[model samples]
Target: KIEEGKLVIWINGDKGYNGLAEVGKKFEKDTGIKVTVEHPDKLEEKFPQVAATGDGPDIIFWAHDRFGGYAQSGLLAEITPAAAFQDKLYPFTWDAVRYNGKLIAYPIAVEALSLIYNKDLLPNPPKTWEEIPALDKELKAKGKSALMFNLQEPYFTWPLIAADGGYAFKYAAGKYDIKDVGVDNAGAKAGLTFLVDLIKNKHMNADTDYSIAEAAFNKGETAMTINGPWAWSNIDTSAVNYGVTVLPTFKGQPSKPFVGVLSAGINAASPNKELAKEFLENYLLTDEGLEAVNKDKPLGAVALKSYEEELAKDPRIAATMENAQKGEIMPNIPQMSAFWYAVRTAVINAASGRQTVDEALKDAQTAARAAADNREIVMKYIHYKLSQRGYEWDATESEVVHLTLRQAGDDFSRRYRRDFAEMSSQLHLTPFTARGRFATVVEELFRDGVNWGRIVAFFEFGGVMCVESVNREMSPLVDNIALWMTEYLNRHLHTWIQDNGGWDAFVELYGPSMR
Candidate 1:
């Protein structure tokens, strides 16, 4: 007996996509549950309105990550009855959905954050995060870079956390408690610090967001990046070689990824609740039903029983399974919702050089601390500098203020560094904290480059001396003035030889004899 009345489903807008559009017909044709899917403009807004009116969908097909917040808000019904769905699904998936011992939404897919790289670029990916910096340095010497990461991206940090055996928030008996946030945990700090060092060592591109990173790899500019299979299709296989692998391990920890799941549940409020129960017990859980659903998707099945022969038909699923096994499973518990953003934000900050690893994790723990006693700050000033001002055109906010500049001149140095954009990507502008002064040469490079554009730009302190004029624009005589000034600096200053430390580097490449 199927539900006689209409079952309204307000689907979070995947842009009018019915989650099961491909197979939803079969479900409706077999069972007379007139499933009308209303795609809302804003699920975040629509869900609360519906909840306020005591009118929610018969079943929501959202993952636990988003739904956890809803359960916290009391907008979604807790349907996680251990007797119904909890016992059958994988503990990871089950844990993700459960909020206060109640499951709010049924999962329909298992999403993961894994690592993807270009096989042509790196036939052998680093087995561990420790090797990332050295590999990146090797790429830089070749006029290339190995990887890229957005300091603001969260998905990229998931692997970092997992590699360190870190938790977003402390989990208690039934759910997240306000006192257990692990953002500042020592392991979390180690992961964040590791990423920061990677950036400093020049292993990653300054841009790590989803769009830019993928584009960089597709264009063969980057060797690797952390991403998922959702991105697998975006690669132009014909343009370059690419491959997918499990996230690299850190220390003794595995690169665990969050698991996504989609499952069917009985609606207790429905008049046909009994029939719904029957359907789940008989048809839904049957071997045939499980196999059919498993066969439709590209990921490994959430069902525990074997589907090796069926799964083998698709190589990607097998690959995903192989990679997924190497990582920690995503939590399904609804309470975990509060931990995701807070933890991610902290991790990204540390990796991008905005915050020290210790500070980033501390902030993350503080954000998640809200739920720990019950589990996620303001973006600090440094973050704004790294992410926003770094790429501004004729960026005049301030000069580059690194560890080399005088403490008081830190602000001034950043304001002055704007003169040199071509070299900004490569140079490290530091500030002297104790003495409110500047290095005569460093100051001259920045200030003179900005004012006159006539200083000789140092390439490794001596090697191939060139006038700051080389950086001059398309203008006529004045442009030559800069180059001439550079040549003049070369004659007066001791010309570096290849045998010496800095000179040797240039001579080896340019050759010993000069015209």
Candidate 2:
């Protein structure tokens, strides 16, 4: 027996959850199904277990990277939307949600990295990365940086690496060749060498994290910065006249950023599978529903082709869409998990000049191979970090951690830093305050004897130094430290209503959203 008048969705409480809420209201009004929207902190880990118990939300919103794992585990219901509905979205987005030649998720939004510049500082953005340093003297004379970004963070640094034919793996015949790791190759070295030049010449600092880079751009201290669509809200569009463009060319070749898709998946165990399918096909995928979901602030272009003109009206969305069309879609494979930390470590080593570019990349390649061969070590460290923090992991949660660590790879840490930075930049709140709200939730969920306030303070300082060291010295320890911190936060995700306090108190302390 199906519940005809009810639908539940577990949404990631990050920047995009609000959009889904509006859609939920409209869907309920139209269909008479009481739609319940819940933002759970660790839905990626919690969903499978809860669903397996035959009691969980019918729908789950998350990134596409996790889709492959979920589908492989038989946790997701195969969803082949109507041909008309499928045609609305860009064809490539389908690739992100498809597994074993079946479409298993609904694509919502597209994200890719681009260069954002202040028009007041530089009327024209640089055409290539090399020209950025060439204008350093003039820009500095005018009290501006030539360009700035989280140069040490691997996510932002990847454009430089890929500009010279570097890739994490060689994909062939619908599978990634894990044995053919490309991080330490000649192209990667050349790419790293160029980044090192910027640091050596003082055109850009080695210590610029997302917050510093974003703040500098917002304050008119720097002419340009490299970031993605998600950072747009942080820039006070009313205060700063800015423009966004695809990443600058490198070595006469265009730099490519990984194209990622935001998508929604269906729970295989849901009794209301029919309603869930209909709602997704007829309601959420519609243009009006999508517009409402996007609302006042849209992070990226909708995957739907019919909405392109509307997305193009906002220059930022236009820039993001352009990048997505030209950028390389991040491969949605289980093997891609081992790439993030390894590559980040390499970038940190080379950019900080702790290791020569060649040696750093080689070390990265070696670490990735070793890391891939032994996920047990990764799981053990994850468990140790959680246990140290007083978090109790059940068997189900344990498997979730392993899958999450594998699928998320370095993204867990990347997003942790990004969330804090985005909040600080947008709310003008101290990163400490931002971190506190997050820590408060974690503390509330797990009543560890250790004072979370002190834990917050420790990691806050450690996070700053870890980000700083990526650019300053030859430290082989920051990535490892960051990885531990990331696992701890991810390991303890809880629902505000069910696990932590109710929503009102959460909003009172953490502001409206985690953004």
Candidate 3:
């Protein structure tokens, strides 16, 4: 039976979506079910934990790229759009929100990088990349870059580099072949070489970052750059009167950027899962709900074809969909991480003249291959978490943990780096005093069980709980807490873990077929 209480959802708007806020009140009045919308300050890090623990929001609205791991981990409930609804959205939007042919989220909108040019500087965008040289000749004389962007970011530059046959992975037979690395192939080489020439010939800045590109474009220091609708608000559109268009062609092949989708999904473990799905379909996907959202943030280039005529009224937004139609949906899988790291390295190396494009790309192929083949690391992660949970591990947890651990450590550090400023007095406490104090503090902590999620929250937030005499070195108490927890599990569950085929059982369970 569907639970009939309040439904809660988390989206990234600053104060929660104002439109949804009204819909929520009316729905509660009509259906006698309360709805609360929230914009948590730390949703990115915090949501994953609650989702793991089955205590996250009933529904969550976020980018679809993240739904792959969530779906694979059984953290999300599948949805079937009504035939009328399904047929209305652009089909490509489903690519990001699906895993193993199941729909994991409802596609809300689509976006892609496109040529954003300053109309004051150029009445119309250049017809082709070759035309850029002539435009650059005049802009260079004025000491301005012809084009500016995060040149080293693989996502930003992949379009030209992907001009012909270039791709990060091969999607064949309805799945991506991570074993195949295509960035170094002939087609990609042509694309990479073109970008390198842009810097080599001084048509664009060599070391530009996203911030620099935005700043330059906002100040009208560059004639053109490329970015997506997510950043449209940041540009000084009033000052520069910018226009967006599909990227200028290179070498007779259309530039193919990666398409991205933004969506909303239901938490599988919520008691209100059915109700959450109903709310999403009946209210969140409707014209009224979307109209309010557009008032706050333009629903640029939405997959919902009903908005086509209205969205087309903004030529800039219409141009983005044109590019989206031409671009490929980036492979949504864990191995795609390896592609990002590898391709960025290759772009930097080739652009800096540190290596030839062929050499840089060849080395990148090797780097990607090694990263993909390193299943041992993934298995090691599962083993660590299982050991932490006292052997309460499962296949789904194993899959999600690997993906979360990929960025957890670094993210925790960056998020809480300043937290140590408080409780500085705890630094001088004796090791024994601090360790004992930490132990007493954690003992009082309560949760459903000793799951990995709670353990991780403890590991991250233990130092900041204001326990007496706990040294905060930034602190040794932090490492001390982790080791303290690890040693207890060793004293308790180590034998069981070893008797059960050690960590190898985890490796075998993950298996070669999974990836």
Candidate 4:
């Protein structure tokens, strides 16, 4: 049994820290229970390890995607809210927190990726993805693109496939049937073809990553963009009038954006279980508490129906709610952890025209199946163990562990590649095993025609180097390295191909036939 005078919470720094700090004070004042809000680095990894050992915060605050995994591992306490609580919130919010028909968490806010457009530039959002091409010329004349998004991210691109009946898995009775993987289905192929057409027609580019796309949209360089509420803070509303809507259709089918729910749950092992329930029900679920918790951070449609009218007063919030209603709820299954890699590589291949639509989808389907069967999971576990020992693995070493083989010159295939190469070179061994092989093959391919695979490989390798620098724990040494690397790449590497021969030259050297 725990003391009646104390409660603890763990949340991500950006998600609920400040909001909860203020609410914690009010809760303590009302109930005389001292509240502690802790922000731990690597909290995602930390939460499970600590929770499974019967220690850590009383509540876990995060997205719904990982809730299933936590619940299945017996880390979550089954939370049964009052009937009144169920009646007051959006019905879909329940789907987010429920695992095996039991509520494992309280849904806080709803999020769905939507088409946010500059009202000054495009008065009406495109009704369909096909309609975007018609306005491209007009937008280009005004120094804008019709639509833009992070092409490399599967989350943003998957909607196009889903619009035409493609899906990650089939739903049977109530749960996702992972055996029904749908990456290379007819709908997926059609979606890939549509995406390729957008790239081929200069609607968007493979180079525009999350930051670039967000920056361009906020700066009005693009008339419209596909993003979510998390990015709303970055928009300079004072400079631009923006509106949000559901993603436009693909071939008359609605684009189903992934609906993400931000939620809070009680750790099964928490000693202060009854106190935690009281806090969640009487305080956190109340209007005053919800408002206090979200005052500094204005969220999209919160789960409470009481706030609907008040939230609807804000156009952005209303639009987000509309999209959320139309969007599909993200499946909160452990199997989803493996979905990203295969889909990401497939989208990149198709968008860059390195592979035909069918070929890309086929590869994606194959990868998704292998991943669902625990191939990537096993490989990742081995990699994690190796990483703890400060051990570095090359492509050869990776293959020894039955990992997916790297392509010739694929530098960013793993996180430790660059450092490993440099260390190996210092020891007087050949520094470039893959790069050396890549150079020879690339020369022949470039001479013959465009080899997008090789070109994308080079670009992705540089991107890996950039991402590694950014992801490290900050120190003066690490910070300076990140800044310098970001600056060097942003100024030089990204501009190299465009400056040399433009997109046409790049196409000649890299682009393959899509149809």
Tens-digit lDDT track for model 3 on 1-515?
Answer: 22348788788864227776777777787788899888887675456546654567887777776677566556678887777778767788877787888888888877789999988887878867778878899987887767888886899999988877798888887777777989879999988998888888878767899999989988989989989887777774547778888898888878899987878888877788777777777776677767767777776777777776577878888888888887888676645766887899999999989999999999888867756544334334434543443442222565553444423533553566566545333444544354566566456543344433344344444324322212221122233344344443433333554566754553454343235
Per-residue lDDT of 1-515 in model 4, one digit per residue for the tens? 22345888888876657778778888899878898888888787677656644566888888898887778767789997788878888888998888877999998888888889999898988889888888998889877888889887889888887878788878676678776788878888888788888888888887778989988888888999988887887785547678887678888888877888888888887877788888877777677877876786766778888876677788778878777776678898856645676788888887777888888888778766654433332323333433434533220442322222122223234545777467434432111232233344335544644443444443343333322322331111121222222332333333453466743554443323211
TM-score of each: 0.60, 0.71, 0.74, 0.72
Q: Ranking under TM-score, best-scoring first? A: 3, 4, 2, 1
Model 2 worst lDDT run, 10 consecutive residues: 489-498
lDDT of 2 at 388: 41
Cα RMSD (angstroms) for every candidate in the order listed:
21.0, 15.7, 11.8, 12.9
Residue ranges of candidate 3 with Cα displaced over 4 Å? 1-4, 14-16, 380-515
lDDT tens digits, residue span 193-306, model 1: 677667666566445677887778788888877766656656745386777666777885677665555444333344544444444444444445455544443334344323
lDDT per residue for candidate 2 within 364-448, as digits (tens), equals 8886675543434343444444444354322144344343332232333455767756643443222223344445544654465
lDDT of each: 0.49, 0.69, 0.70, 0.69
Each model's number of backbone clashes?
Answer: 63, 1, 0, 1
Residue 17, model 3: Cα distance from true site in angstroms: 2.0
- Could you tell me which 10 consecutive residues in candidate 3 have the lowest summed lDDT? 468-477
